[PDB]
Design a protein around this motif. Structure first.
Motif, mmCIF file in Angstrom:
data_model
loop_
_atom_site.group_PDB
_atom_site.id
_atom_site.type_symbol
_atom_site.label_atom_id
_atom_site.label_comp_id
_atom_site.label_asym_id
_atom_site.label_seq_id
_atom_site.Cartn_x
_atom_site.Cartn_y
_atom_site.Cartn_z
ATOM 1 N N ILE A 56 0.919 -1.331 -0.128
ATOM 2 C CA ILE A 56 -0.052 0.122 0.130
ATOM 3 C C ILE A 56 0.873 1.354 -0.036
ATOM 4 O O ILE A 56 1.525 1.522 1.012
ATOM 5 N N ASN A 57 0.862 1.901 -1.122
ATOM 6 C CA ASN A 57 1.503 3.358 -1.263
ATOM 7 C C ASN A 57 0.553 4.265 -1.641
ATOM 8 O O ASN A 57 -0.095 4.341 -2.908
ATOM 9 N N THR A 58 0.395 5.312 -0.873
ATOM 10 C CA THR A 58 -0.691 6.344 -1.261
ATOM 11 C C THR A 58 -0.124 7.199 -2.362
ATOM 12 O O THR A 58 -1.132 7.608 -3.319
ATOM 13 N N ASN A 59 1.193 7.633 -2.404
ATOM 14 C CA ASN A 59 1.591 8.482 -3.261
ATOM 15 C C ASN A 59 1.848 7.882 -4.696
ATOM 16 O O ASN A 59 1.410 8.500 -5.609
ATOM 17 N N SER A 60 1.748 6.617 -4.697
ATOM 18 C CA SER A 60 1.632 5.945 -6.077
ATOM 19 C C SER A 60 0.492 5.650 -6.561
ATOM 20 O O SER A 60 -0.748 5.544 -5.698
ATOM 21 N N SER A 61 0.034 5.916 -7.822
ATOM 22 C CA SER A 61 -1.090 5.585 -8.607
ATOM 23 C C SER A 61 -1.449 4.314 -8.953
ATOM 24 O O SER A 61 -0.602 3.445 -9.061
ATOM 25 N N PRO A 62 -2.681 3.755 -9.197
ATOM 26 C CA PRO A 62 -2.996 2.587 -9.879
ATOM 27 C C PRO A 62 -2.015 2.236 -11.120
ATOM 28 O O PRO A 62 -1.641 1.067 -11.317
ATOM 29 N N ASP A 63 -1.698 3.307 -11.657
ATOM 30 C CA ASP A 63 -0.742 3.185 -12.742
ATOM 31 C C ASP A 63 0.909 2.513 -12.301
ATOM 32 O O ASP A 63 1.066 1.566 -13.285
ATOM 33 N N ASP A 64 1.281 2.694 -11.244
ATOM 34 C CA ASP A 64 2.351 2.410 -10.730
ATOM 35 C C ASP A 64 2.437 0.981 -9.944
ATOM 36 O O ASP A 64 3.606 0.508 -9.895
ATOM 37 N N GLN A 65 1.287 0.339 -9.895
ATOM 38 C CA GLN A 65 1.478 -0.732 -8.898
ATOM 39 C C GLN A 65 1.941 -1.982 -9.513
ATOM 40 O O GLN A 65 1.150 -2.922 -9.814
ATOM 41 N N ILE A 66 3.191 -2.067 -9.793
ATOM 42 C CA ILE A 66 3.938 -3.364 -10.380
ATOM 43 C C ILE A 66 5.199 -3.245 -9.859
ATOM 44 O O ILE A 66 5.921 -1.995 -9.758
ATOM 45 N N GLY A 67 5.982 -4.387 -9.612
ATOM 46 C CA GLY A 67 7.312 -4.396 -9.420
ATOM 47 C C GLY A 67 7.633 -5.928 -9.040
ATOM 48 O O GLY A 67 7.343 -6.882 -9.575
ATOM 49 N N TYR A 68 8.724 -5.947 -8.225
ATOM 50 C CA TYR A 68 9.377 -7.240 -7.662
ATOM 51 C C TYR A 68 10.067 -7.288 -6.229
ATOM 52 O O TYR A 68 10.310 -6.210 -5.923
ATOM 53 N N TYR A 69 9.938 -8.405 -5.963
ATOM 54 C CA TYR A 69 10.733 -8.737 -4.554
ATOM 55 C C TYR A 69 12.114 -9.300 -4.639
ATOM 56 O O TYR A 69 12.059 -10.228 -5.511
ATOM 57 N N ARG A 70 12.996 -8.893 -4.206
ATOM 58 C CA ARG A 70 14.552 -9.051 -4.317
ATOM 59 C C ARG A 70 14.854 -9.585 -2.942
ATOM 60 O O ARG A 70 14.656 -9.126 -1.715
#
Ligand code: U2H
Lengths: 126, 128, 127, 127
Positions: D28-42
């Protein structure tokens, strides 16, 4: 764009902010006794009446330990524009569960100091 | 091909970086509507051979670029990047401003940078 | 207790001219308000304060919605010294008692953001 | 220059590894938009003196957005040892260089919080 959880303290004197040992932490009903630790950060402002650049009163903003523009600074670190306050019994740990404030969501809490707190000369809130 | 900022630079003299409160910071451009008043300042450091012979840092320059223009054209407003600070005037549009673009100094002088009246500057910065 | 204040930060003036706004603009942006509530007035605020001098300070202007503040009973466009009126088209000439004034011990002031495309006269600045 | 994750780490206390369903695992990141909610765990393993030897501490797994972090040049779904990919319904396959990574000198880490209803494999807690 992060901000402080509180409103600033304005400085009219010529000396930096300096609270005595034990006071200076803003009141926060959501925080615990373990969180009552942080630092005030001075922010200077300049404007343009016709004498070119005018120097306004600096304002000091409070940030919890481990948060804010100097989140990586340890308690007691000597830096210009940074002064440290803590309430006895507070833990020397970063308060990243509190973080900083997003103005697009929450507004600044009115800074109130605990009963009996002494502000230095020439320091007033709002 | 290789274009410059539309405005002269703000030279950093103090130890602070160039920051602006919400609303202020966009240079005055009479040739633009209030929808365009939004962009970023890109710091550009210059190194010179000092009087001793070893390289020394010159005072940093900050160049203004409209959103979607300049070296960081492909960045959205509020992007997190070192040496890049964002400014916008109340009522601007979060769209690329290609209609403004960037300057070719061969056929266009730089507009002297001027800030809105009553703009707060950090220490070490001067508003003409 | 018994503390009354403006909902917005002040408009300090370091010039020799009083405050004026052209018709249609001059109201500050407030997210928690409707276009019907975009009508009010700015009130003057004198002040004084190195040592050995009774320094005359720069006057500020605080915005109050129509029917609120130290001049709540005044109607829009009323003639009084130190008071100027501002409003945008599409606003109602009604008292905004539901907006009221601010208690400076419970809520912080809202930063004065002028309307989209509004320039303040020479000698004035927000802070 | 040198940067860290924007969030705190998910510590692997059990033997299972991170695996999320279709549309779960983005913090959950308020600053991030639904466009940005993608990534990876290292996965980040740490070694310590066991008391006699080298002991591999319980590996902490930090989350970096797409395009950011020590694995910048990797697109969503890239197969690499120690990397698990995560998306949310309604985002983009874009290097989120506007989000970047965190400089701990001026930014605290956001406590890793996951939306209500998220499922997790065995041995996983946030500390
Ligand atoms: C009134 C301004 C209130 N906004 C907060 C300013 C804002 C607008 N667009 C942003 C994009 C990113 C950002 O912060 C970067 C960041 C934070 C946390 C995690 C990853 C990256 C802040 C902003």
């Amino acid at each position: 764009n992060t901000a402080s959880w509180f409103t600033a303290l304005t400085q009219h004197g010529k000396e930096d902010l300096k609270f005595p040992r034990g006071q200076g932490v803003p009141i926060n009903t959501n925080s615990s006794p373990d969180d009552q630790i942080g630092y005030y950060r001075r922010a200077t402002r300049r404007i343009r009446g016709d004498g070119k650049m005018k120097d306004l009163s600096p304002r000091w903003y409070f940030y919890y330990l481990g948060t804010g523009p100097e989140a990586g600074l340890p308690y007691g670190a000597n830096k210009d524009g940074i002064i440290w306050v803590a309430t006895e019994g507070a833990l020397n740990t970063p308060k990243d569960h509190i973080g900083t404030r997003n103005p697009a969501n929450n507004a600044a809490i009115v800074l109130q100091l605990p009963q009996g707190t002494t502000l230095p000369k020439g320091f007033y809130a709002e």
